[PDB]
Amino acid sequence: EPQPASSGLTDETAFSCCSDPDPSTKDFLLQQTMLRIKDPKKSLDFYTRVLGLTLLQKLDFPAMKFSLYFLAYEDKNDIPKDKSEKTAWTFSRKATLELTHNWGTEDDETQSYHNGNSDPRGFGHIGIAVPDVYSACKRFEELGVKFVKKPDDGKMKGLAFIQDPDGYWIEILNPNKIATII
């Protein structure tokens, strides 16, 4: 029953590669995903205004000439005012997006970041779960967002991919509708 190896893993092989978690890893949290961004204006506007994330915090590194922007689906009225307080909070949020701006890249017409979906491949995308793919995407269209895959294109109806201003892919999906699609 181990599959032909041009056929992928059986459930058995796969599951048997899984161990229950060591109890010292309880309380571990998947806190952030870092993406490099060419232009923090385009990017902050895309993630806050279009996608509805809240800018939790900005960190500056004047020596090393770069800034970090931390965004998440969080209530602004939860963001601490105090500096240290604010940082501990931000960095204890789950499911956060860290955007790294290297100074000057916005003026560099020669410069662009690679989105991982052409050679050499790796990272693919982040994805947002929404209650209605078609209504969200209709608004995205209204707001000038660029699409990789419209919700109705292809076999997978009801799932979409849009680009952020650096070309990074963002999946848009409805958890109550995925099982129909697959």
Catalytic residues: 171
> How many CB atoms neighbour CB 147 within 10 A?
15
Tokens of 31: 């806190």
Verify binding: residue 181, Zn ion, rule CB under 5 A.
no
Q: How far is the CB of 144 from its own copies (least distance, A)?
A: 14
Verify binding: residue 33, its own copies, rule CB under 8 A.
yes
Q: Which helix (H) or strand (E) holds 16?
A: helix 11-16
Verify binding: residue 100, ligand CBW, rule CB under 6 A.
yes
Tokens of 6: 């041009």
Q: How far is the CB of 65 from ligand CBW (least distance, A)?
A: 8
Q: Which does 90 bind (CB under 5 to 8 A by kind): Zn ion, ligand CBW, its own copies, none?
A: its own copies
CB 52 within 8 A of CB 73: yes
- Mark residues 94-133: x for contact with Zn ion by CB under 5 A, - for none: ----x----------------------------x------
What is d(CA 49, CA 68) in angstroms, rounded to the nearest whole number? 18
Cα separation values, 26 from 32, 75, 96, Å: 17, 26, 19
Q: Which of 1, 78, 97, 160 binds its own copies (CB under 8 A)?
A: 97
Q: Please, which residue, 78 or 153, has the CB nearer to ligand CBW?
A: 153
What is d(CA 143, CA 49) in angstroms, rounded to the nearest whole number? 10
> How many CB atoms neighbour CB 117 within 10 A?
15
Tokens of 158: 């009801």
Verify binding: residue 104, ligand CBW, rule CB under 6 A.
no
Verify binding: residue 157, ligand CBW, rule CB under 6 A.
no
Length in residues, the chain: 182
CB 177 within 8 A of CB 133: yes
- Mark residues 140-159: x for contact with its own copies by CB under 8 A, - for none: --------------------
Verify binding: residue 123, ligand CBW, rule CB under 6 A.
no
Q: Which of 32, 48, 50, 66 binds ligand CBW (CB under 6 A)?
A: 66
Verify binding: residue 78, its own copies, rule CB under 8 A.
no
